[PDB]
Design brief:
Elements lengths: L1 H4 L5 H4 L14 H5 L17
This protein binds one RNA strand through helix 2 and helix 3.
Amino acid sequence: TPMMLNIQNMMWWNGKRNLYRATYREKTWYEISRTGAFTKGRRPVMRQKY
RNA sequence: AUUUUACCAAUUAAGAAGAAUAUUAUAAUAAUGGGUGUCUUAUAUUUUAAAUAAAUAUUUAAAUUCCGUGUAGUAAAUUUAUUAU
């Protein structure tokens, strides 16, 4: 398995890509990782001020 | 009458489009694989899968550990955005 072997298969690097990944990723791993922008740590959640 | 010894020296101003829709970086608005001298026929032209990836991250702490390979929303669609004869 390429991921197990730690093979750097990237389209801009060698023109290859692993077949077990998803073609479209809505938000990258960094976007998923950043939790302060996802949870209610300090950010306000309802911008409407009635 | 006859006849001028042997050897030794040096590179510089360039005659005429015989040099530009040029070379490199730079545009954050396009994009189904560009192919001209091409020019029916689609049983014969199908590439999809939750993972670090043509998507790429503002600090020195603590901390697992026999050389600590290491830092968080900054604004919630907010303007750092892969641009372009």
